[PDB]
Amino acid sequence: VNQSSSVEVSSESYETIFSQRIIRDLQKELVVGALFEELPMSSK
Amino acid sequence: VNQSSSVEVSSESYETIFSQRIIRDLQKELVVGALFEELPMSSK
Numbered sequence: 001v002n003q004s005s006s007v008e009v010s011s012e013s014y015e016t017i018f019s020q021r022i023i024r025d026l027q028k029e030l031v032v033g034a035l036f037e038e039l040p041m042s043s044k
Numbered sequence: 045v046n047q048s049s050s051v052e053v054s055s056e057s058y059e060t061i062f063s064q065r066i067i068r069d070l071q072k073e074l075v076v077g078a079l080f081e082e083l084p085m086s087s088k
Binding site: 042 | 045046056059060061
């Protein structure tokens with residue numbers, strides 16, 4: 001799609017480097033779940 | 045109960061692990077019972 005040059009590439013796939021960094025946003029942190037303690041129940 | 049599988053416990057009492065732990069709340073602090081001294085009386 002850069003058609004400026006006479007000999008332009010077929011797709012934009014060939015004009016792009018697909019890095020595979022899997023970036024992520026700040027994701028809501030979690031507090032409520034771990035604060036408390038467990039009663040290892042072993043029965044229903 | 046927990047009747048999901050062939051083979052089930054009979055009463056759900058054979059399920060629950062009854063505990064014998066007893067718990068009492070924060071329970072009103074008794075401030076004025078002992079603040080003051082005693083006159084050990086021996087008559088009305």
